[PDB]
């Protein structure tokens, strides 16, 4: 399993962000609005190949979370599409970025704004977001935003779609890495 692939909770589907480590311990990052209501994660829609258990969730205000792997034998790939991901960086306006997710696959664009505040309604406001002209659709949440070998963000939400175009906002990954004391690979 790799960044951008489907992950399933008891209620629905999101996308894996990045695979991460602290020493010999493996985890993955995803969106906080995905981990908020989900303890166990599975790799398959049948909900029989366990991935692991949520260990941290931050949503709203932020939108990031973390799941520790309990499945010792599943492959935990370190690439996104063919791309190695070995470090994290901050977004900058104009940076070229690619997202992968389990609804729409791989789509690219530019960073168009930093530190955006995004109101999802119902009290769920997120701050500090990267805005982009990349499209996304429901189920893509949590998937990686990258640029070359650098992790940049985790898919949060947006408007539009991948048929006619959209605007998608991402949680910067660096804050999740720091919060959880892990490193992307």
């Amino acid at each position: 399993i790799s960044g951008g692939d489907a992950i399933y909770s008891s209620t629905g589907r999101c996308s894996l962000g990045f695979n991460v480590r602290s020493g010999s311990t493996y985890y993955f990052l995803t969106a906080g609005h995905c981990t908020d209501g989900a303890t166990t994660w599975w790799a398959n829609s049948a909900r029989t190949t366990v991935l692991g258990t949520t260990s941290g969730s931050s949503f709203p205000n932020n939108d990031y979370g973390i799941v520790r792997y309990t499945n010792t034998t599943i492959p935990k790939d370190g690439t996104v599409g063919g791309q190695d991901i070995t470090s994290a960086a901050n977004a900058t306006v104009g940076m070229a970025v690619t997202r992968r997710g389990s609804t729409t696959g791989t789509h690219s664009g530019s960073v168009t704004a930093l530190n955006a505040t995004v109101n999802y309604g119902g009290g769920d406001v997120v701050y500090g977001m990267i805005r982009t002209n990349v499209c996304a659709e429901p189920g893509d949440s949590g998937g990686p935003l990258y640029s070359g070998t650098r992790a940049i963000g985790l898919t949060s939400g947006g408007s539009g779609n991948c048929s006619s175009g959209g605007t998608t906002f991402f949680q910067p990954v660096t804050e999740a890495l720091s919060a959880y004391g892990v490193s992307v690979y």
Partner: peptide, 4 residues
């Protein structure tokens, strides 16, 4: 905007 809407969560994905």
């Amino acid at each position: 905007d809407a969560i994905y």
